[PDB]
Amino acid sequence: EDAELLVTVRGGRLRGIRLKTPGGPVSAFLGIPFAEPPMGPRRFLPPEPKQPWSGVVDATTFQSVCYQYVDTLYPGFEGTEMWNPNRELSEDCLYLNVWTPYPRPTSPTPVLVWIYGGGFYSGASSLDVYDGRFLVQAERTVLVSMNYRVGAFGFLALPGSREAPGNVGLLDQRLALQWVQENVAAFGGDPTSVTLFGESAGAASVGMHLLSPPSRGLFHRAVLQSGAPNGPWATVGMGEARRRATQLAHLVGCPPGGTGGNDTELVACLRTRPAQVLVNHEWHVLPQESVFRFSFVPVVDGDFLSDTPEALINAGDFHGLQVLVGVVKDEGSYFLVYGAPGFSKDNESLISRAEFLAGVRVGVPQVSDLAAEAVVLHYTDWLHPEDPARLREALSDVVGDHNVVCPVAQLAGRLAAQGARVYAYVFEHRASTLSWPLWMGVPHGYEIEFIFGIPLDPSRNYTAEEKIFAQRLMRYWANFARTGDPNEPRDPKAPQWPPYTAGAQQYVSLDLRPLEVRRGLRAQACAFWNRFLPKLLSAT
Amino acid sequence: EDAELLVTVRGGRLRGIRLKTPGGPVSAFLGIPFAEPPMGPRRFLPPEPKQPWSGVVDATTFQSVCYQYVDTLYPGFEGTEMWNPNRELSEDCLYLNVWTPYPRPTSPTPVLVWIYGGGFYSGASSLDVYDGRFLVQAERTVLVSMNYRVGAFGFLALPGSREAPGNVGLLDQRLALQWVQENVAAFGGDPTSVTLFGESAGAASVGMHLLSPPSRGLFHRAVLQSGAPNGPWATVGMGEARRRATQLAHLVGCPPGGTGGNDTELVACLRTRPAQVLVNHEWHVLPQESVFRFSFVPVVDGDFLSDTPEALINAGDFHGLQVLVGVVKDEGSYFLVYGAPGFSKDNESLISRAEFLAGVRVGVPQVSDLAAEAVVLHYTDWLHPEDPARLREALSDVVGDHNVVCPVAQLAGRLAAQGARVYAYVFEHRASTLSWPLWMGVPHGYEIEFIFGIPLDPSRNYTAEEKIFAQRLMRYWANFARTGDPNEPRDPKAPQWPPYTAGAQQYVSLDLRPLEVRRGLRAQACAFWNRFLPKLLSAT
Ligand SMILES: *[C@](C)(O)CCC[N+](C)(C)C
Ligand SMILES: *[C@](C)(O)CCC[N+](C)(C)C
């Protein structure tokens, strides 16, 4: 019992907490420091390892959320506020959490590291939908989740500078992975079987960790849910990163007056500003009106990413690696209520032809009028070119395919055709608790509560079928973590999940019904985005 | 009886012939001269009306075919030689034929004028598949068919010249229509109910007669089968026409030596050459390797066509006109054995990816590498990008849509949306007698034998179902000629044929089964050709 709630790691000692699930207790260690607080002169810099302490650190409650913008588009609405911070905001925020089974496993157990999404500008490991108590109890594995800096504090980059090098939010994630290497065995975890998994910007982070040598030696399998490192939103160039960082400094009064504008004094002035001041101007440095675009994201600096994610995927060897990838049915609907004209979460969003054509300029920013014309051609139903419900679904497919589905299929194809064993899925169940409107289908990010077993929580009004569905999905993810193969290593009756190959392009659909194999991750639509559109942009 | 085999028209007297069909005799007048022979100094010039004669002209057999190239791609093969000339070749060839019922109708009967196709380079009114004896006997109407000059003799144009103005093959057709106005009443025909119908280049001719004022006063309804005046092959510009005419003169030794090259002496030298000499070099003036392209076709001269067919369709009023238009299921397969690499009528033509990409350059000549890339994107099955049978069908759709199906749908839409009542069909029956291979489906031009009632010929091995099918199709065409409405004016049980509108885009499919209404003349594919591709070519 309480003998297992006190663990000694290399920094010192910790007191854990025992959480209860309907089928047994778990041991949790919430709020372990893994880095020095990145405040004062440490803002925008890479993290430093946490110095050893004396006494015991209390690891019984989640620590503070990293400073981030707070969504206020629909105040009081469950759909948006379920992702909003549930702890006080502070720059002192680099803490990680470990869930471990009770009684503690006697032999090394596979470790899953969760990396949250939120467009690299928001999110926290302390959210209720990321509670690792159900997954660890049912599948008897070790779950780790960390906080990493987001927004300007994580990804403001002045390239070439030493004061604001950029990507330090990814460096926070890497330090946590070194920490799991050096300490997970104390909780019963195998440091030789580590599986990263993330969603949205978490999946792009997992992807970028695949393409940088220093991080690859810290894990062994990868799960990318609804995101990829080569997505048009997950990366920015050195020239644009400099422009957004400088525009931000200008908006907050740096350089004052008055004085020259070198990088050292720009960051020195940015470091004297209160954290909330930088946050209130973060959306004001975007170049266009757009959905699915965020200000401060990973930069191609030549260090963490020696080349663009596209180049690094094409010129890489991935033998001996297993990857699980997939999308939900309606990847694009979620973002349309964030800017697309005619869209509102409180009505049918039956848009007109004129609003559809305007929405295309928002959903596909930074492209020529001719390029937009190609998008309108491919995504119009010329038998019903003005049907509002069809144009609604079309724009959702425009945003979905351009930002998630096609970037993912591109990554999955090349990974399989270059040594990696890849499994692909499509999440097609819509939760009965979903507070978003019906026309959004299954939106971006609403598979997570089923991967984490949230339906097992008795205080939630899920259905009996959805509880069995959750337990099935948890086994898939756990099995992939133990064996690298989502299929149960011996049972044959349940339908099997074939790998994804560049030729057959096979994937399964996850819903209340048994597994069904399909072919093609929107192959027709994705050929436009992955093949034809790049050439259409090179030729003026 | 034989009292009705002698008719007096405004030129003189004629002796006809009585032909037998399984259900009654018909009266035919084959070989009536309607113009002076365009020989010697009359070559390349517009036709002159036939001067009155004395005695009686024998109108009992077909006259001579206009000089034309003779297909020799498959000597001895029924599929090709059924379209080859079946009478002696001569420049003395401007003759027309009238079929009329027996006994002669007592009240004015609607008149159908047939205009044959053959890429404006071949064809004759004397072909067996254009025999008007079955259609006139069963539906008791008047059928007229003429010969018009083809190839250089009909369409060699030096624009601005008076010696070779061009389009005189169309002027031969117009003179025949004036003739039907001035003489059809002598055979029992109503000069106030004239219906043009043609196929391939015959349908483009019917279309161009709709867009030129002097010819519109000569007919009242139009049927366009597998062709349109705005097709990329049916028209050439003044600059290109001059180049092809001059290249032809060069190949036959004009100007000799030696002397300057003005238009008057070029045509004067072209007129001293034997007809067979000009024919043997006709294909040698084409600019590229291509299918569905022909050397000497109608020219935009500003006279017969004041503007391009595209401009004239867009800026025209078509109220009070009824049009019947349609295509066969596989418009493109026929031409692939004329140049597309990998294609042969004697094997399965299972082409490779490399041959498909080369075939696209042949089937869509004169377009940029980027434009071809768009065609490959839209017509590739990215789930089976190297399936030979799928690429075979894809290339047939490339040629079919680009040259026939999309040019037709473009014309039908604007006609309906500008006053004309339009009916649309798709011919989907493959004759049991078809000697072409199976993979060609139903090819270009193999609805004609069913419109003319050829299956009723007892010496042919057609099936009993196909005989009923022919009689049904003949009623459709006849009903449209009498009433302007293909549906039977009173019977309701048989399914009805709704008009074609730009919005609903409704059409019927013609085969052994009852009428079935469908929507969309390849709307998705045709939006690429009619909307997006033009813009892709303007932008370099
Ligand atoms: C992705 C860009 O990180 C989007 C994440 C959105 N939520 C709702 C999943 C946080
Ligand atoms: C059209 C271009 O005239 C093609 C006609 C081909 N035949 C086989 C119908 C003559």
Curated annotation (Swiss-Prot), chains A, B:
Name the catalysed reactions: acetylcholine + H2O = choline + acetate + H(+)
Q: Which Pfam families match?
A: AChE_tetra, COesterase
Q: What is the effect of changing S200A?
A: Loss of activity
- Catalytic site: S200, E331, H444
| Keyword Ribosomal protein on entry | no
Q: Does the keyword Glycoprotein apply?
A: yes
Covalent S-S links between cysteines: C66-C93, C254-C269, C406-C526
UniProt: huperzine A binding residues:
W83, Y130, Y334
Q: What is the effect of changing H444A?
A: Loss of activity
The glycosylation sites are: N262, N347, N461
Q: What is the effect of changing E331A?
A: Loss of activity
| UniProt enzyme class | hydrolase
Q: How does it sit in the membrane?
A: Peripheral membrane protein
Sites binding huprine W sit at G119, S200, W436, H444
Biological-process GO terms, alphabetical: acetylcholine catabolic process; acetylcholine catabolic process in synaptic cleft; acetylcholine receptor signaling pathway; amyloid precursor protein metabolic process; cell adhesion; negative regulation of synaptic transmission, cholinergic; nervous system development; osteoblast development
InterPro entries for this protein: AB_hydrolase_fold, AChE-related_enzymes, AChE_tetra, CarbesteraseB, Carboxylesterase_B_AS, Carboxylesterase_B_CS, Cholinesterase
Supply the alphabetized keyword list. Answer: Blood group antigen, Cell membrane, Disulfide bond, Glycoprotein, GPI-anchor, Hydrolase, Lipoprotein, Membrane, Neurotransmitter degradation, Nucleus, Secreted, Serine esterase, Signal, Synapse
This protein's source sits in the domain of life called Eukaryota
Q: What is the annotated tissue distribution of the protein whose record heads this document? A: Isoform H is highly expressed in erythrocytes.
- Binding-site list for galanthamine: W83, E199, S200, Y334
Citing just one GO molecular function, the answer is: collagen binding
Swapping H319N leads to an effect described as: In Yt(b) antigen
Q: Which family does it belong to?
A: Belongs to the type-B carboxylesterase/lipase family.
Summary of subunit composition and partner proteins: Interacts with PRIMA1. The interaction with PRIMA1 is required to anchor it to the basal lamina of cells and organize into tetramers. Isoform H generates GPI-anchored dimers; disulfide linked. Isoform T generates multiple structures, ranging from monomers and dimers to collagen-tailed and hydrophobic-tailed forms, in which catalytic tetramers are associated with anchoring proteins that attach them to the basal lamina or to cell membranes.
- Give the protein's function: Hydrolyzes rapidly the acetylcholine neurotransmitter released into the synaptic cleft allowing to terminate the signal transduction at the neuromuscular junction. Role in neuronal apoptosis.
What this protein is called in its record is Acetylcholinesterase
What gene does this protein come from? ACHE
